[PDB]
Symmetry: D2
Subunit: 268 residues, 4 copies
């Protein structure tokens, strides 16, 4: 009945009620999934946010740069879902690039310390979470991560786009490892979504030039998309993630599903 | 409950019980869809084959090279499903290339009359069916066609691969037109499936050289696929088509979903 | 000294002094190549046009839809360059799609007779010319064809884009055959060039809607290109074709080189 | 006469006489270029190696992880080529990934410290060198870097492939910056070349499993390539780099040229 009835799914990446992962979690619960949530740093805030989900879910702390958090993660999940139970799904919805790499300054001005932190959080951590959680995943399981199509350079978000190029490559290798467990690994490449951070950047948080370029980027998306694109509505993206978590794409792995209104298939 | 409960879906392309479209139809009916079937030329044979589906379905004749069949198709579908009802889904599972283009002779020996017939049936007809059926499709509907990844040349099936390259391009334009109706258009790129025609070719129907090349092509597929690939089992492909017919990929159009075990994401 | 000193090269596709093939021929002669030209239908006009090239060149008639022209072509070339001499290069600069397929009407209104004629001239003929000329090509030779990136759908030129998708696929198979002769086969994907036909379409030859869409398409190209794009200057495209005809890309075949200002690598 | 007559070109990446950059330098000098070389760490060794080039060239020390080396690089180049002279070309032939990331252990066992060092040297440094050298490059200049097609995952060299995915993305952004100077930026994606490090790995330096997988990877390359692939001969790769350094690909930037025998265009 529900698309994800009886499935146990870990969802990372909630920080506000406009996080893509908040809508992934809401839709997954609507479809019968039992969730375990992970959050970074502001756990009191995240608990208050996730109190608004349709069902209660245990919240675990996870800083993906903390090797001790990752080393203990599987045992804390098993404690939360009960011994003898394993996960059927894992959602990676985690990304960050320090400001020096996202247009507040020229691409050339980002120090490598900043780029390497962003690639750690946004790309390497996808392999990190798979390594931690595959030992407690059931055959037929599914790992899904969030992507923004990096196949062409864009005016702003420069180093973040490089990090997404690395993530797409990491995903293909995670699929190799996950296949030994009977588990699939895929990314959902979403169009632009007006999260709190996104709206701040359009408002000029990283400079007027970066704001104007991203606003024009957003506008062309809805113009290109044959079915349109609503940057204020994350539900179509959440449904696509749930599709990959379900049993209905069983021969897809190492791959990228585009939830972008079809915009990437059109020129003008 | 059922993935496709209450949806009205037209399925083309059944000719034997090993047709990919036979398994698409079976799975769609398992998931609550009400079907209308179309068949080419041997309608008595196709009716006997489809008597084995879990539910009865009206069968309409459709030769996609016959402009009179296409001009009458929408009215015959409306008669079959009842006035005031429209389609929610359309499945194109149609392909053919005369033997001169598929390895029985060198690529250079195929006369254009043969190539143009194959491109008519295998690529142009996707636009033909969309033109005929979009006027009787509901908003939120879905058109799905079958593909075999043509991004690289392969030893055999040469002109058929050229026809698939054309089909992928046709799909992106059909998505533009379908979007005006609130309808999505996508292809499923399947790995090799042992249909009756496929087994005959491996058995040497088009020459020993073509048979040996296709057998080695099949074997590398399961070796590359991180989750494996079973050429004897079309159900994973049928489930993927049903996923695209459902409401769970609502922001994907003009696109290609790979149901190939992940083989196209791996080198060796 | 000259990039193409001593090379014997056949160049198809001249019809006016704004043809891309006119500039290919001019640059090749500047670089020391000895040319044989082929022309379609209006041979008196083409001879008057090519009288303006820096050197005289024999002109042969070639309608690529005429099997008798193709069957005699190799012998007529050998007569023109002398017995015991072979070609080092072949340039395919041929394209056509009847008006019903290029935006004067909706994509769905093109009859297949029109599409099949356009695919014959624009895609199948690349294999046709390779079949005719490979028997009289030297090892180390090069076949080059002209392309317009069809990986995404564009507002107009719809069926012509489908034909380019087919041509890219044909090129990969021609490379397989040409390799047995020690010959490379590649396409140059050019940005928009203001030929006489192009200017007529922008002027509204195929309707005001098609004209406006193509004008906006052209403008975004120069905006995207990191080094800019001058649609009035075919010389950068001609130089790229000469690069592929030379010995300086000796390990590239079945491939596509983009002479588009870098526009296809950028989003906005 | 010479392809690169009068051009001033910096070439990084020589360490042995089997380095790809050694053959790039040799061919560039054969074609009239005046070189400045950069080398990492073992400068006495590199000078003895480059004494075998057809012409003497100044050698400058450059560790791309050393910000002081990069901050002084432009001034040291200007001293070497003379005040009032600028560079016409820059070759990046630099790559490294610590052993934990290249198959001596499972992909999951590479610590991020190792991955981040490899991405620093193999990808970020392409932007680092462009930032340092664009202020002393002439309009019409060219930056070229070395690539190994990372679009699909391969058995070994795992994290190095992720680093190449990042490099391809970096190249598209460097093209944006370089265009303001009238300079192009491109990568050459080479097939496998038997450098000293490559032969050591096939010999089992990183374990027997990694050695066997890379040997089978090499063998399929020559089998796929329509013109063949000779892993013992770097000259076709060097010629392709020289083609991009020349004026004969003037409308290509942000792009990738494949010098791989056509292998990436073929499946089997
Ligand atoms: N336009 C968009 O918003 C958009 C489009 C496509 C893809 N994405 C991707 O979707 C993902 C979710 O981003 P979002 O748009 O929902 O914004 P968001 O700010 O709501 O989510 C980012 C999440 O990353 C988490 N995070 C940051 N550092 C972490 C760390 N060290 N350890 C663990 N978690 C950490 C944040 O706590 C936060 O929960 C990101 O990968 C993003 O790049 C976003
Ligand atoms: N390995 C595979 O079998 C494989 C893999 C990927 C994609 N595909 C694609 O899946 C589609 C279905 O093929 P299949 O493998 O199930 O083989 P199949 O022979 O069972 O189906 C082919 C169908 O095309 C129909 N057809 C032929 N000419 C027609 C015409 N003039 N009008 C209407 N219908 C016509 C046949 O009647 C038949 O029903 C094809 O597009 C095929 O290329 C097949
Ligand atoms: N914007 C552009 O102009 C552009 C951009 C990229 C690629 N191209 C491609 O470059 C090629 C050359 O086109 P062009 O732009 O120089 O326009 P053009 O009109 O000058 O050249 C087209 C050529 O095709 C030839 N041709 C048509 N039918 C033929 C037949 N039956 N047999 C032999 N030749 C025939 C014409 O005679 C003409 O010489 C075409 O393939 C075109 O699609 C053009
Ligand atoms: N099969 C192949 O060999 C192959 C194929 C395609 C691409 N490539 C790429 O070609 C490039 C050249 O590699 P190669 O195959 O000639 O091997 P190589 O070992 O001869 O060259 C590697 C070079 O990187 C340099 N380097 C390492 N660390 C450095 C640092 N901190 N600062 C500056 N330089 C540093 C080395 O000193 C060495 O000169 C690399 O980017 C490689 O990935 C190699
Ligand atoms: O990685 C992202 O989250 C991302 C979001 C974007 C949102 C708007 C425009 C460009 C963007 C590029 C990105 O890499
Ligand atoms: O179009 C197809 O149905 C097709 C099937 C194949 C099946 C096996 C190998 C190659 C194949 C290529 C094709 O284009
Ligand atoms: O094939 C072509 O010649 C072609 C030219 C174009 C020129 C301008 C815009 C779109 C275009 C699409 C094409 O397929
Ligand atoms: O980056 C490289 O140098 C590289 C070389 C290879 C050489 C042989 C096989 C795989 C390889 C993968 C790589 O990323």
């Amino acid at each position: 009945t529900g698309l994800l009835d009886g499935k146990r799914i870990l969802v990372s990446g909630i920080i506000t009620d406009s996080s893509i992962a908040f809508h992934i979690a809401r839709v997954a619960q609507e479809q019968g999934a039992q969730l375990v949530l992970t959050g970074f740093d502001r756990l009191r805030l995240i608990q208050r946010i996730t109190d608004r989900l349709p069902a209660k879910a245990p919240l675990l702390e996870l800083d993906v740069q903390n090797e001790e958090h990752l080393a203990s993660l599987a045992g804390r999940v098993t404690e939360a879902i009960g011994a003898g139970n394993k996960l059927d799904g894992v959602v990676h919805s985690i990304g960050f690039m320090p400001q020096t790499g996202m247009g507040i300054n020229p691409f050339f001005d980002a120090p490598y310390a900043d780029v390497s932190k962003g690639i750690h959080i946004s790309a390497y951590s996808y392999a990190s979470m798979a390594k931690a959680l595959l030992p407690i995943m059931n055959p037929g399981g599914s790992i899904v991560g969030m992507d923004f199509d990096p196949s062409r350079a864009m005016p702003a978000y420069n180093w973040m786009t490089v990090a997404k190029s690395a993530l797409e490559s990491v995903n293909r290798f995670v699929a190799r490892e996950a296949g030994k467990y009977g588990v699939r690994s895929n990314l959902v490449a979403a169009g632009p979504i007006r999260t709190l951070a996104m709206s701040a950047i359009v408002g000029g948080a990283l400079g007027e030039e970066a704001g104007a370029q991203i606003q024009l980027l957003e506008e062309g998306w809805d113009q290109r998309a044959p079915i349109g694109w609503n940057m204020k509505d994350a539900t179509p993206v959440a449904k696509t993630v749930c599709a990959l978590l379900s049993d209905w794409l069983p021969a897809t792995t190492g791959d990228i599903i585009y939830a972008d209104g079809g915009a990437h298939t059109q020129l003008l």
